[PDB]
Design a binder for these strands. Structure first.
Length: 341
RNA sequence: UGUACAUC
């Protein structure tokens, strides 16, 4: 199975083995854990002629290496450090196989690497091969990373078909383990005509989204990178619900982002909501202080409050300072207070 | 004291 050269090599019989000495054996070495390492190492600093010798033996069977547990690394190295002609020739070997590779445990890494290094004409051609398979890829553990890379690297106008597929399914996808990732990449890189519809569906489903295991990240994302009009719509959904959501494992993260990224006015309103509102005998703020998640929202409020408003919070907290010590999460508020005394 | 994101 293994050639004498490869076996003898794994048996450490060639401490000084050079690329040029494995002529004829590139494919075999590329598919071998140690040989693949040997080649990768040797490549970054090989001479163009050495690099070309290695290339000559992998071009024809390049696909075989792209879906290989060790070979995929040798392909990638050519995309990173090979010549322009070598990258173009590798792209040609991918033609017709993008879907198959994008779903592939190792091939998907080659697709991702290629997207980063090839000219836009080739990028665009790779993308078109996913035409009619958007959701299949977005929902695949290998493929979603490829769709993400496309969005990061490819001209946004060529990605219109991905948008088309998302239209009407933004809620479903935003609560998906992989789809929430792709939605965020879209918000970052896509055109206004493309992000708009997507933002519309996110706004329609904010209540549900802030409480979702994966959806909360998409709403947080808009709060940190979104336009003010989009942040405010989200903030308006949190208003009147500060107490309840900040007690929630997932949504409490979103109320922190609202506190942090809201306008001056919106921030003052959210903090006042829980200084004013009473949860039974005492303030909403006091219930929050004792909560496993809500105690985090309080601290964030102390962090970002205007000095004047911070004084009001500290005053709301002060009367409970000795009782806070009796509560697992209460204790944590005291730690915060030291900083401010 | 608290939630996601993949190869030698």
């Amino acid at each position: 199975g293994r050639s004498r050269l490869l076996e003898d090599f794994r048996n450490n019989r060639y401490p000084n083995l050079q690329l040029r000495e494995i002529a004829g054996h590139i494919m075999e070495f590329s598919q071998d854990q140690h040989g693949s390492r040997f080649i990768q190492l040797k490549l970054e600093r090989a001479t163009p002629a050495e690099r070309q010798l290695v290339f000559n033996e992998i071009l024809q069977a390049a696909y075989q290496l792209m879906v290989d547990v060790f070979g995929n690394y040798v392909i990638q190295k050519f995309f990173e450090f090979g010549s322009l002609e070598q990258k173009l020739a590798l792209a040609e070997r991918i033609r017709g196989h993008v879907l198959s590779l994008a779903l592939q445990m190792y091939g998907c890494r080659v697709i991702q690497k290629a997207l980063e290094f090839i000219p836009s004409d080739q990028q665009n051609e790779m993308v078109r091969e996913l035409d009619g398979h958007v959701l299949k890829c977005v929902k695949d553990q290998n493929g979603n990373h490829v769709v993400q890379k496309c969005i990061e690297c490819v001209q946004p106008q060529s990605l219109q078909f991905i948008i088309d597929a998302f239209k009407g399914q933004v809620f479903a996808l935003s609560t998906h383990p992989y789809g929430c990732r792709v939605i965020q990449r879209i918000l970052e890189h896509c055109l206004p005509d493309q992000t708009l519809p997507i933002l519309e569906e996110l706004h329609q489903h904010t209540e549900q989204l802030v409480q979702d295991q994966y959806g909360n990240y998409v709403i947080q994302h808009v709060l940190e990178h979104g336009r003010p009009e989009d942040k405010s719509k989200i903030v308006a959904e949190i208003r009147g619900n500060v107490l309840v959501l900040s007690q929630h494992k997932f949504a409490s993260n979103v109320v922190e982002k609202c506190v942090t990224h809201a306008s001056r006015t919106e921030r003052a309103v959210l903090i006042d909501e829980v200084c004013t509102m009473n949860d039974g005998p005492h303030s909403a703020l006091y219930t929050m202080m004792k909560d496993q998640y809500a105690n985090y929202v309080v601290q964030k409020m102390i962090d970002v409050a205007e000095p004047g408003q911070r004084k009001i919070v500290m005053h709301k907290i002060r009367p409970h300072i000795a009782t806070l010590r009796k509560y697992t999460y209460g204790k944590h508020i005291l730690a915060k207070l030291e900083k401010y005394y």
